[PDB]
Enzyme design. Structure first.
Site, PDB file in Angstrom:
ATOM      1  N   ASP A   1       0.818  -1.187   0.000  1.00  0.00           N
ATOM      2  CA  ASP A   1       0.000   0.000   0.000  1.00  0.00           C
ATOM      3  C   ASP A   1       0.872   1.265   0.000  1.00  0.00           C
ATOM      4  OD1 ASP A   1      -2.916   1.173   1.984  1.00  0.00           O
ATOM      5  OD2 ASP A   1      -1.862   2.053   0.312  1.00  0.00           O
ATOM      6  N   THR A   2       1.158   1.783  -1.193  1.00  0.00           N
ATOM      7  CA  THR A   2       2.006   2.991  -1.303  1.00  0.00           C
ATOM      8  C   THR A   2       1.364   4.245  -0.681  1.00  0.00           C
ATOM      9  OG1 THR A   2       1.316   3.371  -3.645  1.00  0.00           O
ATOM     10  CG2 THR A   2       3.356   2.164  -3.261  1.00  0.00           C
ATOM     11  N   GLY A   3       0.054   4.190  -0.495  1.00  0.00           N
ATOM     12  CA  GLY A   3      -0.688   5.305   0.078  1.00  0.00           C
ATOM     13  C   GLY A   3      -0.791   5.303   1.585  1.00  0.00           C
TER      14      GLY A   3
HETATM   15  C1  LIG Z   1      -9.230   4.997  -1.301  1.00  0.00           C
HETATM   16  C2  LIG Z   1      -9.665   3.549  -1.356  1.00  0.00           C
HETATM   17  C3  LIG Z   1     -10.477   3.018  -2.466  1.00  0.00           C
HETATM   18  O1  LIG Z   1     -10.835   3.833  -3.445  1.00  0.00           O
HETATM   19  C4  LIG Z   1     -10.850   1.673  -2.461  1.00  0.00           C
HETATM   20  C5  LIG Z   1     -10.467   0.809  -1.428  1.00  0.00           C
HETATM   21  C6  LIG Z   1      -9.704   1.266  -0.351  1.00  0.00           C
HETATM   22  C7  LIG Z   1      -9.292   2.605  -0.287  1.00  0.00           C
HETATM   23  C8  LIG Z   1      -8.449   3.116   0.838  1.00  0.00           C
HETATM   24  O2  LIG Z   1      -8.919   3.838   1.703  1.00  0.00           O
HETATM   25  N1  LIG Z   1      -7.174   2.745   0.811  1.00  0.00           N
HETATM   26  C9  LIG Z   1      -6.279   3.006   1.913  1.00  0.00           C
HETATM   27  C10 LIG Z   1      -5.828   1.706   2.566  1.00  0.00           C
HETATM   28  S1  LIG Z   1      -6.965   1.122   3.798  1.00  0.00           S
HETATM   29  C11 LIG Z   1      -7.949   0.018   2.953  1.00  0.00           C
HETATM   30  C12 LIG Z   1      -9.281  -0.170   3.327  1.00  0.00           C
HETATM   31  C13 LIG Z   1     -10.109  -1.073   2.654  1.00  0.00           C
HETATM   32  C14 LIG Z   1      -9.596  -1.796   1.582  1.00  0.00           C
HETATM   33  C15 LIG Z   1      -8.268  -1.617   1.191  1.00  0.00           C
HETATM   34  C16 LIG Z   1      -7.454  -0.708   1.874  1.00  0.00           C
HETATM   35  C17 LIG Z   1      -5.132   3.795   1.313  1.00  0.00           C
HETATM   36  O3  LIG Z   1      -4.426   2.923   0.440  1.00  0.00           O
HETATM   37  C18 LIG Z   1      -4.216   4.422   2.366  1.00  0.00           C
HETATM   38  N2  LIG Z   1      -4.766   5.738   2.675  1.00  0.00           N
HETATM   39  C19 LIG Z   1      -4.738   6.772   1.631  1.00  0.00           C
HETATM   40  C20 LIG Z   1      -5.410   8.066   2.098  1.00  0.00           C
HETATM   41  C21 LIG Z   1      -6.935   7.955   2.133  1.00  0.00           C
HETATM   42  C22 LIG Z   1      -7.492   9.354   2.405  1.00  0.00           C
HETATM   43  C23 LIG Z   1      -7.050   9.864   3.776  1.00  0.00           C
HETATM   44  C24 LIG Z   1      -5.529   9.809   3.962  1.00  0.00           C
HETATM   45  C25 LIG Z   1      -4.874   8.517   3.460  1.00  0.00           C
HETATM   46  C26 LIG Z   1      -5.028   7.386   4.469  1.00  0.00           C
HETATM   47  C27 LIG Z   1      -4.234   6.175   3.976  1.00  0.00           C
HETATM   48  C28 LIG Z   1      -4.370   5.115   5.015  1.00  0.00           C
HETATM   49  O4  LIG Z   1      -5.452   4.558   5.104  1.00  0.00           O
HETATM   50  N3  LIG Z   1      -3.297   4.875   5.793  1.00  0.00           N
HETATM   51  C29 LIG Z   1      -3.307   3.938   6.928  1.00  0.00           C
HETATM   52  C30 LIG Z   1      -1.947   3.971   7.616  1.00  0.00           C
HETATM   53  C31 LIG Z   1      -4.376   4.316   7.951  1.00  0.00           C
HETATM   54  C32 LIG Z   1      -3.580   2.517   6.439  1.00  0.00           C
END
Ligand SMILES: Cc1c(O)cccc1C(=O)N[C@@H](CSc1ccccc1)[C@H](O)CN1C[C@H]2CCCC[C@H]2C[C@H]1C(=O)NC(C)(C)C
Lengths: 99, 99
Positions: A25-27
């Site tokens: 997860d690069t994000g």
């Molecule tokens: C944006 C998005 C979609 O469009 C579809 C599915 C999931 C997500 C999603 O929220 N992905 C997140 C992983 S957490 C996650 C949750 C459920 C499934 C997969 C990953 C991002 O990759 C990471 N994500 C990107 C970003 C989201 C907006 C708010 C700030 C960051 C928060 C960060 C994050 O959550 N970091 C943690 C350390 C808390 C894990």
């Protein structure tokens, strides 16, 4: 390995004797695992995602084996629906984005 | 470009005539931008991250220039604290993970 992004980049991890699947997860700044028990003391942490915040437990200097590569780092544990390997651990396994 | 993961993988995008920075996010299935106006009709969508769910507007066939690479795809717009380029658009610009 090269991993393309047509599907979720899921890899197998070994952490605290258990095998799990985790998302590269690069994000994510941090590494976040579902509930499991782990060695050492921890500290409370709040982490913000997209929908709001969760409470986690922060463990430092935890061994993790990600796709056959060992790394030691901070692992947060709490109610995430998927195990997330963040940048803090990806740097340790020499993981890059390329295009 | 090779991008390492010591810092957040932020790139410049051009969308709807505007310039923004966005995070290359291998852990996001979808692309999610902060509030902005956009061509065509949209459909309501709920997306779930860590912390819970947000409501967004889904726009299809939206042109985006990511680090100078054109891609066309689905862009979700709503209350995200960070612009996120997900896998749906990363695949279009030839973007891989490597180690
Ligand atoms: C944006 C998005 C979609 O469009 C579809 C599915 C999931 C997500 C999603 O929220 N992905 C997140 C992983 S957490 C996650 C949750 C459920 C499934 C997969 C990953 C991002 O990759 C990471 N994500 C990107 C970003 C989201 C907006 C708010 C700030 C960051 C928060 C960060 C994050 O959550 N970091 C943690 C350390 C808390 C894990």
């Amino acid at each position: 390995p090269q991993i393309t992004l047509w599907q979720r980049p899921l890899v197998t991890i070994k952490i605290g004797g258990q095998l799990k699947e985790a998302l590269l997860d690069t994000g994510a700044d941090n590494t976040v695992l579902e509930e499991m028990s782990l060695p050492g003391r921890w500290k409370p942490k709040m982490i913000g995602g997209i929908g709001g915040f969760i409470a986690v437990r922060q463990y430092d200097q935890i061994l993790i084996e990600i796709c056959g590569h060992k790394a030691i780092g901070t692992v947060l544990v709490g109610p995430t629906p998927v195990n997330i390997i963040g940048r803090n651990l990806m740097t340790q396994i020499g993981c890059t984005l390329n295009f």
